[PDB]
Design a protein around this ligand. Structure first.
Ligand SMILES: Nc1ncnc2c1ncn2[C@@H]1O[C@H](COP(=O)(O)OP(=O)(O)OP(=O)(O)O)[C@@H](O)[C@H]1O
Ligand SMILES: Nc1ncnc2c1ncn2[C@@H]1O[C@H](COP(=O)(O)OP(=O)(O)OP(=O)(O)O)[C@@H](O)[C@H]1O
Ligand SMILES: [Mg+2]
Ligand SMILES: [Mg+2]
Ligand SMILES: [Zn+2]
Lengths: 615, 43, 511
DNA sequence: AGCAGAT
DNA sequence: ATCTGCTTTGGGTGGGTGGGTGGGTTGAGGCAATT
């Protein structure tokens, strides 16, 4: 084992660390106050801000007493400095200020008895990590502070998984990506506490590897002197465990080069950082890039190739009312007022579902868009699905949409299995799984928003709607509102659409200037507020809706006498009308459902289909 | 022991002098003759 | 004589410096490799180190060193590893395959394994043409150890690379740039460049113009809200047998900087998107890019588009619709980028286009899949006297070509590694590269008026169209105008570009 | 390297 | 108490006279039954 002479002495660095902890100020010293809080059992996590270390270094330099570069040393080799700082804190932990129940703690009693036994033996200990009740983390060097003092911050500079190469091992770096998998928290053993069934003593073993070999024979002085063979046994009550969690971080789409596939990197989280990462978040993880040596035979076989991981140390997470809301739903298309109004009604989904007689009327308004290719169906779906909090976008996922609107594109193509699944959902509002491996039943009170094309690919006026639609007639009937959007050539409308699209392509902004769209956040919060509300209905409104129902049934029967009618009205239509009225009242924020809401709902159902069919 | 073998009850018996020995078993947790018998048998 | 190929590498060349050419077919994941470890003895206050070697990290044989980190000093002191001062290097293994066109008769191409360390780690991706220089070696005991009872297995072999030389982008000179500009100042540059494409195919002027605009491409715009407008041009050719569709596909394959070849019955849904396999080096689950992913930012030529299956058609539908690939298999969730232009050729349902029957009955592809092609060209073989004489004379002239360096009746069969007139193919490639590398045209109100007028007139017109007018036609018009502006090396789209795009679309739709 | 056996 | 000796991980640098109720799980291609 030859030796080298590196230009680093850990004694001056340790002295600098102690001076920084005891003297630095930014009241009393910041880190001494934090240690005071740690001693009183209030705090259990000490975060070292490299910005503070840089500031302390520059203050010392200004005073003229230049010292060693602590920040660069920490960044270049960070594993050693965790232990160095922990030792420094252990040396300077202040006495507690608030009395605590020492006897309640198992470790206090055990160590007191160990002290008593050692005193008795003398009249004729335990690793430092065992008594530690805090975790130490490094906060990277912020970009602004590095620029303020004319320095380069490697730690806070973001990297992709691709840029993290084999020469970065052992440093303090940052990674940018989206988390794809987070494991469950579990106990990782740091110090193991044994007991002797003969000597009555306790042994401690330190573990800093994936595996270890437990002790089986007493090593106490009494056992060796007496030669008594007392077996050692584990005790989980006295050991020390640290919360452990393993995550995975993947490259962002914009970071992968051309004609390549994304890569992923493991992350280890220990201490109080657990549960700070979940799948789907875009984060800037700061950690120590270390290898993971194999053990035993696997080490011999594996050769010199090494697995790697990141020890998480800091995580940064990234971020007239009706007409206004409708026009603001999607400003990049040409206005479809009726469709947008119906979609908003779907989004709010107001309903009073408390029958309590065995089952209740469905508490979701379902909307279907059917139109010849060319109209903005996919754009409407994408917008309505982004706005919603629970929106789930799929192509012909349901679990994610539970208690929310479901965004199904290409509904007609869908396979019979999914058609049966949705048929079950609408009727029963339940997800049922019957498998030998698992049997889990989940409720699903979720709304469906579908988009489909006619049978022949375009609407044929000669054939009636029913024949144009491939889906079962029962499924169409179950829909609360069915919208049929058609693409009719016309000089004026075509010119307007062309001007709109072309302005959008040239300038990258909305062309309209007559009105200003409402901010999306305001619309979302108002929608949530409306969902929170609950309206009510009287007897007079009940009579009015009943009269409307008989009128609609007579008209629908007369229409069904011919083949043009989509389908004769049914009690489902009455339930849908009252559901729409309730949602409209929710938007109005009034308990008492006005006749105006019912009239507007009637107009909406009429214009859903007849307005365009009669054209 | 009424409970299963892995229940995991640990004991600390005090000798006439201030030293504590460790015994395992619910019967030991209850009784002292059983504790001494186990101490002898575990040798 | 050391310039070889994976087929010609034999045991005679072991322990020698060789240069090998081929296609990269596989590429393992990059994993650091331990070389030196540095420790610190706290009590003694001195650092120690250890040096590790392997069969693939050096050229001279040494005793193997297991990767176990020293724990105790010579005198028994405790040692703490200093990772920040240790030395690890990257390590990757690739496979280079013999060029298929250079293989013998009736033999599948062979391949050799290569190792790249340190700065040669990520210089190649699958589907790249490379020339690798290294030392040909052998490893292991090769069955001489008593554990293996075979007695008929040879030694492992592979190349430790020293250099990697690409064989994709042309380096432009000042003379080339000035020539490109001078040519671009001409008023009929579009016609010259279009005619220069595939000089040996008679006619098909408009298809050649469309192929040129496809090679140039459009301008890709992504909006803040999330809408992502593609700037790629897709082309579909449907026609009667023996109309030069496949030869046009092959010419596009040869000219384009990046192009992947696929057919209908030879491909599969997985083979187009990506496959789940295991890495030999590390034994880790990963994805292998497919035809569509490998052709990212390029072109994919699909022959016999109508002979595919619906299950395999769905993958292409998704790729063309979104321009990405979403994968959910074997506990893998990701989104691969596939931004490619699709040029395809298909045959009508009855093998020959019928004028009487409507276009829907003549083509078996779904309407949704059809709406994703910018230009649909229907080509028919109409028998005529003048046309037949012209085409036959052209074919006869073509068949009489003799390559320089050969005698009559002679059947047809490197030196260093480091290194109205038709425009030659190399200059065409240079022109396309320059234009699509440093021109980003922007629309202008005049082109805007032209485009809106053309769309308005086209949609509401009595005359029937071989394809149905839609709002997508507007995007196609803008894309074609932008590509034509690229052809002239202009920063703005003018009236002329709009009028050219309109004429091309009108020919495509109404013959 | 940990454990299973013969002198 | 010391000296002598075998075998892993999991994987094709053990195999198919050990098999797949001992785990290594997608991809392609052929066949019967279903259509
Ligand atoms: N009113 C409109 N204003 C602006 N752009 C529109 C409008 N209607 C349609 N479009 C454009 O039409 C193009 C095609 O629309 P989209 O993909 O949403 O539906 P579709 O083509 O009918 O659907 P499908 O994929 O089911 O055939 C989109 O680019 C959209 O921008
Ligand atoms: N215009 C043309 N000029 C020269 N050769 C031509 C022309 N049209 C067809 N050919 C000849 O056609 C032969 C084969 O036809 P090709 O494969 O190009 O047709 P295709 O449209 O792909 O047919 P298929 O429907 O059978 O796939 C080629 O050898 C080419 O010489
Ligand atoms: Mg769509
Ligand atoms: Mg062909
Ligand atoms: Zn003991």
């Amino acid at each position: 084992l030859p030796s080298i002479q590196l230009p680093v002495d850990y004694n001056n660095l340790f002295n600098e660390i102690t001076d920084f902890l005891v003297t630095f100020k930014q009241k009393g010293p910041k880190y001494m106050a934090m240690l005071q809080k740690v001693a009183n059992r209030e705090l259990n996590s000490v975060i070292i801000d490299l910005d503070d270390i840089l500031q302390y270094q520059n203050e010392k330099f200004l005073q003229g007493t230049q010292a060693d570069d602590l920040v660069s040393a920490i960044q270049q080799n960070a594993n050693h400095f965790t232990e160095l700082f922990c030792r420094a804190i252990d040396n300077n932990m202040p006495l507690p200020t608030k009395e605590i129940d020492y006897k309640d703690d198992v470790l206090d009693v055990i160590l007191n008895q160990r002290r008593l036994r050692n005193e008795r033996m003398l009249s004729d200990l335990f690793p430092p990590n065992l008594t530690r009740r805090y975790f130490l983390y490094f906060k990277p060097l912020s970009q602004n502070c590095a620029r303020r003092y004319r320095k380069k911050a490697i730690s806070s500079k973001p990297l992709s998984v691709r840029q993290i190469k084999g020469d970065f091992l052992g440093q303090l770096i940052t990674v940018r990506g989206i988390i794809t998998r987070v494991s469950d928290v579990k106990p990782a053993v740091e110090v193991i506490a044994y007991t002797c069934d003969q000597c009555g003593y306790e042994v401690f073993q330190e573990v800093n590897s994936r595996t270890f070999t437990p002790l089986s024979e007493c090593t106490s002085e009494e056992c060796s002197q007496n030669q008594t063979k007392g077996q050692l046994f584990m005790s989980t009550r006295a050991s020390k465990f640290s919360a452990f969690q393993e995550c995975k971080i993947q490259e962002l789409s914009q970071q992968v080069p051309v004609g390549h596939i994304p890569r992923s990197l493991n992350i280890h989280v220990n201490g109080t950082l657990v549960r700070s990462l979940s799948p789907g978040d875009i984060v800037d993880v700061t950690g120590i890039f270390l290898p993971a040596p194999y053990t035993g035979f696997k080490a011999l076989k594996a050769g010199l190739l090494t697995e790697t991981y990141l020890e998480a140390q800091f995580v940064r997470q990234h971020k007239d009312v009706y007409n206004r809301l409708a026009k603001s739903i999607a400003p990049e298309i040409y206005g479809n007022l009726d469709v947008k109004k119906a979609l908003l009604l779907l989004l709010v989904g107001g309903v009073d579902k408390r029958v309590g007689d065995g089952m209740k009327i469905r508490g979701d308004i379902n909307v279907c868009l059917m139109g010849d290719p060319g109209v903005a169906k996919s754009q409407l779906l994408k917008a309505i699905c982004k706005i919603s909090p629970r929106g789930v976008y799929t192509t012909g996922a349901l679990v994610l949409a539970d208690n929310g609107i479901c965004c199904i594109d290409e509904f007609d193509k869908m396979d019979e299995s999914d058609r049966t699944a949705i048929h079950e959902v609408m009727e029963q509002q339940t997800i049922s799984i019957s498998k030998a491996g698992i049997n889990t039943t989940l409720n699903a009170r979720t709304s469906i928003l579908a988009a489909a094309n006619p049978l022949y690919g375009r609407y044929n006026p000669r054939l009636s709607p029913l024949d144009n639609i491939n889906l079962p007639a029962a499924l169409l009937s179950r829909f609360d509102i069915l919208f049929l959007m058609l693409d009719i050539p016309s000089r004026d409308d075509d010119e307007k659409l062309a001007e709109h699209v072309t302005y959008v392509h040239m300038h990258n902004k909305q062309p309209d200037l007559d009105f200003t769209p409402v901010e999306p956040s305001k619309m979302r919060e108002y929608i949530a507020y409306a969902k929170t509300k609950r309206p009510v209905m009287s007897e007079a409104v009940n009579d009015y809706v009943v009269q409307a129902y008989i009128r609609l049934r007579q008209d629908s029967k007369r229409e069904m006498d011919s083949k043009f009618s989509f389908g004769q009205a049914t009690p489902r239509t009455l339930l849908g009308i009252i559901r729409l009225s309730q949602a409209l009242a929710k938007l109005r924020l009034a308990d008492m459902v006005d006749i105006d809401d019912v009239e507007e709902a009637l107009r909406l159902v009429r214009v859903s289909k007849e307005s365009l069919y009669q054209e | 022991s009424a409970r299963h073998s892995r229940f995991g009850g640990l004991l600390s018996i005090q000798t006439p002098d201030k030293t504590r020995l460790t015994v395992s078993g619910s019967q030991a947790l209850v009784d002292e003759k059983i504790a001494l018998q186990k101490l002898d048998d575990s040798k | 004589a050391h310039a070889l190929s994976p087929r010609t590498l034999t045991a005679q060349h072991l322990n020698k410096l060789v240069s090998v050419e081929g296609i990269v077919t596989k590429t393992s994941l990059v994993r650091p490799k331990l070389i030196r470890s540095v420790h610190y003895a706290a009590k003694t206050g001195r650092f120690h180190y250890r040096d590790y070697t392997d069969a693939t990290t050096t050229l001279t044989t040494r005793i193997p060193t297991p990767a176990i980190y020293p724990t105790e000093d010579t005198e028994g002191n405790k040692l703490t590893t200093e990772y920040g001062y240790s030395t690890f290097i990257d390590h990757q293994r690739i496979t280079v395959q013999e060029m298929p066109e250079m293989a013998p008769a009736g033999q599948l191409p062979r391949s050799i394994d290569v190792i790249l360390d340190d700065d040669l780690v990520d210089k190649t991706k699958p589907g790249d043409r490379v020339n690798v220089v290294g030392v040909f070696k052998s490893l292991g005991a090769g069955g001489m150890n008593q554990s293996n009872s075979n007695t008929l297995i040879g030694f492992k072999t592979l190349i430790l690379g020293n250099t990697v030389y690409p064989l994709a982008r042309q380096m432009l000179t000042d003379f080339d740039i000035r020539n490109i500009n001078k040519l671009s100042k001409k008023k009929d540059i579009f016609d010259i460049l279009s005619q220069s494409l595939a000089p040996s195919i008679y006619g098909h002027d408009h298809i050649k113009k469309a192929i040129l605009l496809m090679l140039m491409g459009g301008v890709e715009k992504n909006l803040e809200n999330g809408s992502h407008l593609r700037g790629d041009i897709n082309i579909l050719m449907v026609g009667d047998p023996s109309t030069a569709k496949s030869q046009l596909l092959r010419f596009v394959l040869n000219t384009a900087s990046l192009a992947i070849a696929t057919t209908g019955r030879g491909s599969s849904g997985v083979g187009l998107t990506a496959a789940v396999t295991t890495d030999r080096e590390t034994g880790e689950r990963r994805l292998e890019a497919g035809a569509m992913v490998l052709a990212d930012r390029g072109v994919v030529c699909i022959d016999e588009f109508d002979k595919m299956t619906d299950v395999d058609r769905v993958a292409i539908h998704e790729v063309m619709e979104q321009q990405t690939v979403t994968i959910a298999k074997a506990g893998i969730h990701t989104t691969l980028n596939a931004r490619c232009s699709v040029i395809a050729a298909a045959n009508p349902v009855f093998g020959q286009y019928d004028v009487n029957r409507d276009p829907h009955q003549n083509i078996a592809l779904p309407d949704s899949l059809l709406s994703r092609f910018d230009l649909l060209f229907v080509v028919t073989d109409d028998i005529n006297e003048i046309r037949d004489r012209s085409i036959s004379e052209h074919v006869l002239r073509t068949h009489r070509y003799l390559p320089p360096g050969y005698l009559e009746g002679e059947p047809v069969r490197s030196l260093a590694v480091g290194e109205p007139k038709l425009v030659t193919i190399p200059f065409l490639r240079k022109y396309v590269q320059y234009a699509k590398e440093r021109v980003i045209p922007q629309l202008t109100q005049e082109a805007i008026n032209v485009i809106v007028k053309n769309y308005t007139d086209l949609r509401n017109d009595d005359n029937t169209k071989k394809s149905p007018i839609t709002a997508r036609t507007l995007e196609t018009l803008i894309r074609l105008a932008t590509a034509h502006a690229k052809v002239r090396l202009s920063k703005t789209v003018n009236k002329v570009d709009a009028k050219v795009a309109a004429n091309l679309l009108r020919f495509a739709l109404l013959g």
